[PDB]
Structure 1
Amino acid sequence: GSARENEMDENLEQVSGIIGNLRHMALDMGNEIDTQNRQIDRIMEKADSNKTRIDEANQRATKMLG
């Protein structure tokens, strides 16, 4: 009738398995955030360049209106 220690051991085994899955997700999460952070940096440089081009183009266009 020893079920207490039995369930306890089973629960711990289940927990250990899940922690393995949490490690799995944590590693993927980290790799993905690193990759996206680099992409966001690329995007930010491109956004800055485009804002400059648009600002310059509107100024140039403005000079030929009116």
Structure 2
Amino acid sequence: MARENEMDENLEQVSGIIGNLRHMALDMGNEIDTQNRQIDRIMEKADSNKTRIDEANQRATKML
């Protein structure tokens, strides 16, 4: 039964590790969400600035 006990000892270790993995997966998800919101915002600002640069360039060339 000793081997069985060893097996039992393992399974519990695995269980705890699975707990940690769960918590990690959750933190991972939260951060990925935050970064996706951020990337969205970045793309909006980037498009805005691109439009501004195009407009300013057109006006600049107009006066040449």
TM-score between the two structures when normalised by the length of structure 1 = 0.88
Instruction: Tell me how far apart the structure 2 counterparts of residues 25 and 60 of structure 1 sit (CA, whole Å).
Output: 52
Instruction: Tell me how far apart the structure 2 counterparts of residues 56 and 64 of structure 1 sit (CA, whole Å).
Output: 13
* Cα-to-partner distance string for 1:19-43 (whole Å, 9 max, x where unaligned): 0000110110111111111111111
Which segments of 5 or more consecutive residues in structure 2 lack a partner in the other structure? Answer: none
Offset, 1:64: 1.6
| Percent identical residues | 100
Offset, 1:7: 1.2
Offset, 1:13: 0.6
| RMSD (Å), alpha carbons | 0.8
Larger CA deviation: 12-21 vs 55-64:
55-64
Asked if 1:46 is matched to 2:26, the reply is no
Structure whose residues are more often helix by fraction: 2
Instruction: Tell me how far apart the structure 1 counterparts of residues 6 and 55 of structure 2 sit (CA, whole Å).
Output: 71
Asked if 1:17 is matched to 2:5, the reply is no
Which segments of 5 or more consecutive residues in structure 1 lack a partner in the other structure? Answer: none
Offset, 1:59: 0.8
Instruction: Tell me how far apart the structure 1 counterparts of residues 37 and 26 of structure 2 sit (CA, whole Å).
Output: 17
